[PDB]
């Protein structure tokens with residue numbers, strides 16, 4: 173009946189794990205600010221398992237097949253001949269994660285005659301073309317706050333890694349060297365620097381709370397300013413615009429969604445506004461930053477470092493210039509798919525599927541598109 | 554007259570820097586808790602310069618030769634035929650940095666007929682044999698607090714780096730891969746975990762303040778408990794002994810000096826007390842952890858990661874097992890010699906020399922051994 177097409181990334185090359193490094197995941201009561209953790213009616217997995225790969229199946233097979241649904245799992249997602257595009261024509265639901273995203277391009281949504289729900293197992297639905305989903309009445313949902321703390325932790329890690337020159341230094345240790353001067357001729361403390369966040373949402377504000385005790389000057393921007401109390405707790409400095417903020421910052425971190433208003437906000441023009449030796453960490457989306465502008469700004473010294481886990485095209489080509497540029501601290505798109513995060517957004521995925529199929533309302537936090545218009549968290553993009 | 558022997562690390566392999574990545578270091582007013590930054594009569598360098606390598610000379614040659622002292626700088630420090638051992642015979646002062654340490658072994662202190670001051674440009678004087686210094690009336694001093702905050706940043710960066718599996722993931726990025734499942738089959742959030750510090754000194758407490766907003770549970774141990782007032786601010790949980798603390802901790806960080814009571818405090822015996830999949834970050838000294846005990850603990854799964862910048866011997870042999878073990882996030886000893894940190898301990902170095910040669914007292918907080926007994930900070934070992 174209702175076909176669920178599920179696009180997950182490949183198992184590890186040495187095989188799906190028969191052992192994890194630890195015996196249980198920490199208990200998270202609620203998210204900061206009070207949003208409750210996902211509330212499926214049950215879960216068919218043990219928290220800490222690898223839920224996000226083809227063998228993990230997000231703990232959904234037994235649930236869906238119990239309610240008579242077809243459940244198709246694949247990692248083959250790129251191309252017109254891919255298993256995704258072939259099973260897409262009559263799928264009722266599509267689930268994919270931003271880390272290995274099933275791109276729902278305009279022509280693919282055109283092919284998906286039966287599609288009623290496009291479900292982002294994670295946060296951020298920029299791989300689903302909103303224009304078509306709004307036009308065609310498809311519902312688009314995501315698991316709000318599932319990995320925001322995971323990404324916030326990754327962000328602070330990469331800031332410190334860039335300022336202190338971690339990645340090149342570790343190369344010297346693994347390669348048999350010592351080379352103190354080679355490591356530290358590009359190594360600074362973060363202490364006292366000015367850090368600016370584009371976006372003080374769930375990730376952005378979590379980053380700012382975590383940076384406060386490093387004795388840094390915290391600046392931020394977005395469309396709607398935060399309440400003074402919050403600004404004063406952390407000592408935040410507000411800016412109407414991004415461009416007003418960049419010249420102040422030793423470090424800039426990006427923490428906004430990807431839609432047209434924010435695409436290529438970091439480019440050859442805006443990059444001129446940064447101090448010399450500025451650092452950028454982008455854990456939001458790759459297309460927020462003009463790819464080759466970052467490279468050129470690295471090669472010229474405008475930037476002393478770039479780091480992130482987000483790229484475009486998500487499965488970044490082996491030749492992607494960010495992989496080999498100087499002063500890079502990049503990782504694949506992994507921040508939001510830590511084993512701790514997977515436990516939450518796999519339950520959230522199930523909560524949404526239960527709500528969708530039982531005729532119960534999908535959390536307003538979760539909603540991006542519903543009933544042919546933006547809805548819930550999507551209306552606030 | 555009066556010879557000052559100074560051991561510094563080599564210049565970068567591609568040459569001493571002419572163009573630095575940034576234009577200026579942030580201005581730090583005082584250290585946390587109120588200790589004033591170093592107070593020399595002048596500095597003959599620009600903060601942000603590379604003062605710790607042989608060409609930097611810690612900004613000391615012009616000062617020293619102005620007052621008639623001989624000034625000898627070398628990086629050749631290990632071996633009986635080394636320039637350091639052949640110049641130590643009649644040196645009145647010896648300066649070396651922990652990151653490239655001139656080991657003042659008992660046999661070398663015996664040959665040092667004119668030695669009166671052993672100045673640690675940094676923190677931790679374990680490269681100088683304490684017993685011989687006490688027996689011989691030599692003064693031993695270090696620039697307390699000069700890079701305690703720098704190390705606190707390195708620790709939190711390496712905790713996150715280990716828990717989240719940063720280094721192996723970056724290898725997947727630089728090598729042309731994607732391999733999400735390979736990265737995250739060993740990646741967790743830090744949120745909610747329990748972190749324990751051995752030592753809540755200048756580094757330890759700075760680490761604990763920085764970990765608070767990560768929503769981790771914070772434990773600590775040392776010989777003397779901290780004021781509950783402070784304990785209640787960070788929500789610290791106190792433990793009488795280390796062995797009492799280890800079973801609770803998902804992460805343990807070592808932040809104590811190297812003495813007999815702390816040497817090899819992590820060994821095949823105590824490691825049995827750790828949770829499976831525990832993380833250790835050691836930015837204190839290499840000999841706090843039995844080298845092969847760590848390796849064995851990694852291979853068995855007792856530890857899910859080991860990271861630090863401190864090893865033994867330093868310089869670490871190319872075959873050091875910590876450089877190639879699984880789940881390692883090592884860097885050479887660089888935390889305390891970031892360009893920001895060098896500016897401070899090069900000034901402190903000059904302050905102490907001025908105090909020493911002018912007959913003015915060295916600050917109590919700088920003193921380790923003086924006049925045949927432990928002194929100042931060294932009295933608190």
Ligand SMILES: NC(=O)c1ccc[n+]([C@@H]2O[C@H](COP(=O)([O-])OP(=O)(O)OC[C@H]3O[C@@H](n4cnc5c(N)ncnc54)[C@H](OP(=O)(O)O)[C@@H]3O)[C@@H](O)[C@H]2O)c1
Nearest residue numbers: 295296371372373374375394395396428429456507508553
């Ligand atoms: N694993 C990963 O790498 C990963 C994981 C999760 C999310 N992400 C990315 O991070 C983004 C943010 O996540 P989050 O949980 O922090 O989201 P959120 O709670 O929706 O916060 C988004 C923030 O963007 C700000 N913003 C500033 N300019 C904006 C603009 N022009 N359009 C829209 N928003 C703008 C918003 O403030 P105002 O709109 O009020 O100005 C808001 O503070 C996601 O949408 C996704 O793209 C990445």
Ligand SMILES: NC(=O)c1ccc[n+]([C@@H]2O[C@H](COP(=O)([O-])OP(=O)(O)OC[C@H]3O[C@@H](n4cnc5c(N)ncnc54)[C@H](OP(=O)(O)O)[C@@H]3O)[C@@H](O)[C@H]2O)c1
Nearest residue numbers: 676677701752753754755756775776777809810837889934
């Ligand atoms: N990697 C680097 O670049 C770098 C840089 C600076 C320092 N370090 C290392 O880090 C060490 C600590 O630095 P710091 O600035 O935090 O020093 P500190 O201010 O002297 O603090 C040392 C701490 O160790 C605690 N401690 C616990 N057990 C101890 C024992 N058995 N004996 C002595 N002290 C004990 C002390 O508290 P109690 O007295 O109550 O026990 C104290 O809080 C240095 O000595 C050095 O070895 C490394």
